[PDB]
């Protein structure tokens, strides 16, 4: 049996800057690219229209209206056919504004930016990649109290290497006597870089295979040392060995993958589509913007200041360039993952911004409820009441709820039956509560199951399918037996309805979630729908029996008297005793006439085998005439055998309640059997 | 005055006990007995075989 193979995939990895450029840059026929989004122009101070090269730059994204271009002209397209892709001066397609929510923005920071996740988080992978302490690289950037030396392809005619040293106040005017001494760019810009640039270049320099060999050699060297003498020595070797092992793990993963290390120090920042971070237009001019726009505006404005400072190098400054570049880096850090740094930036309400990581991580953000908890159509809340007349495979829907769930099927019923002509006409007929509307919404619901769901779902039986019927009122009538299946009382509760539309879905609901093939709980296999309080009390009272002993007679029945005593058996013969009914139905009939009460004992002839649960027992008194009569009296039944044949005299002492229960069960079985052929 | 009471049935005894044993932070479910066995095995593996 060859199974239905189904190979699906989902990859994830850091992007190359070329990938982002191909994602976002759109080249017009005139040759311009203009994907940089230079200015932080969120929306015009004028009409709320954004701006070219801004947060809502229509030139890079799609049109804000379907067909309307930047100027305002409209082109009829409606098809994927011969039509100008760009409207010459506008350069904007007339396709729907869906592309608004899918177009990607793109900005260029005039400085490499280290991704927050790979540098600030717990054991950052950069530290393992460079085999350097985290404090060293954290001082290379951010704090900027370092001056890294990138060993690379270019020769090193400059004597020695150094690693980094800038934290002493004397270095303001100490090194200039030793530094430079021949030009400025021809010494400082050759090597010894600062900021994230040196880190990225170092990432682009070391060879992975040599790293693997060296770490294997270090592991072999560490493994051949006994030690085990000092607690500090006991725990020092283990951490270093784990460091080496994760180093070779990461390096080997890098070697055989399509991902380059230099991508962890990003240089090009993607920008989320505009429509997914919109500014709400309210009447009167109120705007409910997104904080994402605020951090984006800050980032691009500081990047513009960086470009202005760098392009105006000329008289090159000193610490000012570093200060502004690292401010830009910190701004990008805040934009990517805010709330993870030491100082979280706050807006004009003493509140931290909703960072991208904040959207990604959280029980209310992404990956938690947006992709799992989805509001659906064809649904409606209600209140729950109890209906004892409903069958097990049936519920009851209000007239108001049903018309707002099966509206479209009623539109079928009106259009097909030629009682209406157009969609608008049918909806108009629906809205006026015509008497023929309910005939349709009593005709398309027969056979269409609906899923009832209790709002505080607890177990598997909290959602069940049912066959709805139209009831008059405003409450949903629910079967009492399934209530404990829903764990639902009737002190005020709400039940949500859902309608399966697909034919497959209707088959699923009818053939898999009906409360007649789910009668057992999956815990241990015990019944889940059993007669609860009121029905249980009714059945207990029914099967409660008579009054056994001293509670039925004031005086002892030994009491030698009332024998109608004389020398002959010819006296008054009343012998009230108990009734001697032929069968069940005779007993029920005699009970209907109020001749006997529910617990009044009676004798019933038995024409079957032994059914009442007996035990070792003992016959209290077996009378025996001189002729074969075998009069036996047991605890609750009497047997009259003989010496010839026909042992048919079995009589049962019982009450009408037990007869009623047995008849109920028996006739229920024999009626279900013959009803279902 | 000091009296000894006599409860001490066990620290946690419901959902929290189930959470503690299921969430194996430190192996201490029956480690008054289980940890002894595990350590004994881990030290006695090296044998004739």
């Amino acid at each position: 049996m060859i199974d239905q193979y189904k190979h699906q995939q989902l990859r994830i990895g850091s992007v190359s800057p070329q990938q982002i450029s191909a994602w976002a840059t759109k080249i017009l026929p005139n040759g311009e690219i203009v994907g940089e989004v230079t200015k932080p122009y969120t929306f015009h101070y004028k009409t709320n229209k954004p701006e070219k090269d801004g947060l809502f730059c229509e030139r890079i994204f799609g049109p804000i209206k379907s067909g309307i271009c930047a100027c305002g002209n409209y082109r009829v397209i409606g098809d994927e056919k011969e039509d100008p892709k760009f409207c010459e001066q506008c350069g904007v397609e007339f396709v729907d504004s869906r592309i608004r929510r899918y177009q990607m923005g793109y900005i260029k920071l005039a400085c490499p930016v280290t991704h927050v996740w790979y540098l600030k988080r717990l054991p950052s992978y950069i530290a393992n990649f460079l085999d350097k302490p985290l404090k060293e690289l954290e001082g290379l950037v951010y704090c900027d109290f370092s001056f890294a030396r990138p060993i690379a392809k270019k020769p090193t005619f400059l004597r020695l290497r150094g690693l980094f040293e800038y934290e002493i106040q004397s270095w303001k005017y100490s090194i200039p006597l030793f530094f430079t001494t021949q030009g400025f760019d021809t010494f400082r810009n050759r090597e010894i870089s600062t900021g994230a640039g040196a880190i990225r270049e170092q990432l682009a320099d070391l060879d992975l295979r040599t790293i693997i060999d060296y770490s294997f050699a270090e592991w072999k060297e560490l493994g051949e040392e006994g030690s085990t003498g000092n607690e500090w020595e006991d725990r020092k070797v283990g951490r270093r060995k784990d460091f080496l092992v994760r180093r070779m793990e990461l390096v080997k993963h890098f070697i055989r993958t399509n991902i380059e290390p230099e991508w962890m120090v990003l240089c090009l920042l993607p920008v989320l589509p505009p429509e997914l971070r919109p500014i709400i237009q309210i009447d009167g001019g109120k705007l409910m913007s997104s904080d994402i726009n605020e951090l984006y505006r800050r980032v691009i404005y500081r990047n513009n200041t960086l470009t202005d400072l760098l392009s105006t190098s000329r008289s090159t400054p000193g610490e000012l360039v570093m200060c502004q570049e690292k401010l830009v880096q910190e701004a990008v850090d805040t934009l990517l993952d805010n709330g993870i740094r030491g100082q979280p930036m706050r807006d004009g309400h003493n509140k931290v911004y909703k960072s991208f990581s904040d959207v990604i991580e959280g029980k209310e953000g992404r990956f938690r409820e947006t992709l799992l908890g989805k509001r659906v159509d064809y649904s409606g809340r209600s209140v729950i009441v109890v209906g004892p007349s409903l069958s097990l495979h049936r519920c009851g829907l209000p007239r108001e709820i049903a018309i707002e769930l099966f509206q479209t099927f009623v539109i079928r019923g009106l259009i097909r039956q030629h009682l209406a002509s157009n969609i608008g006409v049918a909806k108009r007929k629906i809205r006026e509560k015509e008497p023929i509307v309910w005939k349709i919404l009593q005709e398309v619901m027969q056979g269409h199951p609906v899923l009832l769901n209790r709002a505080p779902t607890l177990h598997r039986l909290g959602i069940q399918a049912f066959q709805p019927i139209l009831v008059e009122g405003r409450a949903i009538c629910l079967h009492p037996l399934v209530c404990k299946g829903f764990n639902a009382d009737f002190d005020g509760d709400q039940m949500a309805v859902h309608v399966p539309l697909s034919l497959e879905a209707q088959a699923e609901a009818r053939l898999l979630m009906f409360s007649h093939m789910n009668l057992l709980s999956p815990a241990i296999g015990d019944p889940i729908s059993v007669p609860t309080q009121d029905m249980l009390i009714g059945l207990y009272i029914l099967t409660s029996g008579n009054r056994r002993g001293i509670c039925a007679n004031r005086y002892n029945p030994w009491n030698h008297k009332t024998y109608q005593n004389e020398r002959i058996d010819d006296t008054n013969y009343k012998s009230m005793k108990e009734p001697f009914f032929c069968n069940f139905y005779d007993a029920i009939g005699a009970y209907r006439q109020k001749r006997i009460h529910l617990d009044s004992p009676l004798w019933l002839r038995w024409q079957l085998d032994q059914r009442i649960i007996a035990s070792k027992e003992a016959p209290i008194e077996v009378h025996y005439e001189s002729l074969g009569t075998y009069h036996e009296i047991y605890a609750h039944y009497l047997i009259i055998r003989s010496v010839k044949k026909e042992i048919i005299d079995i009589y049962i002492r019982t009450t009408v309640g037990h007869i009623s229960l047995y008849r109920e069960i028996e006739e229920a079985i024999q009626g279900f059997y013959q009803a279902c052929s | 005055f000091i009296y000894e009471k006599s409860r001490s049935g066990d620290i946690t005894q419901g959902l929290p006990k189930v959470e503690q044993v299921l969430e194996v932070r430190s192996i201490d479910s029956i480690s008054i007995n289980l940890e002894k066995r595990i350590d004994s095995w881990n030290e006695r593996i090296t044998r004739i075989l």
């Binding site: - | 049935g9 066990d10 620290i11 008054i32 066995r37």
Partner: protein
């Protein structure tokens, strides 16, 4: 740190007991599954 009910219920000793049958009928010392490790291909060959 714990109410040592102890109440040893279904534990087993810290000795070499139950060699052939490790824990009821759990793991018999096979000595037929893994000579072929050196017999099907080369391990005993050297």
């Amino acid at each position: 740190r714990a109410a040592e009910n102890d109440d040893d219920d279904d534990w087993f000793p810290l000795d070499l007991y139950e060699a052939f049958e490790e824990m009821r009928k759990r793991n018999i010392f096979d000595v037929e599954n893994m000579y072929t490790l050196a017999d099907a291909w080369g391990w005993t060959w050297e």
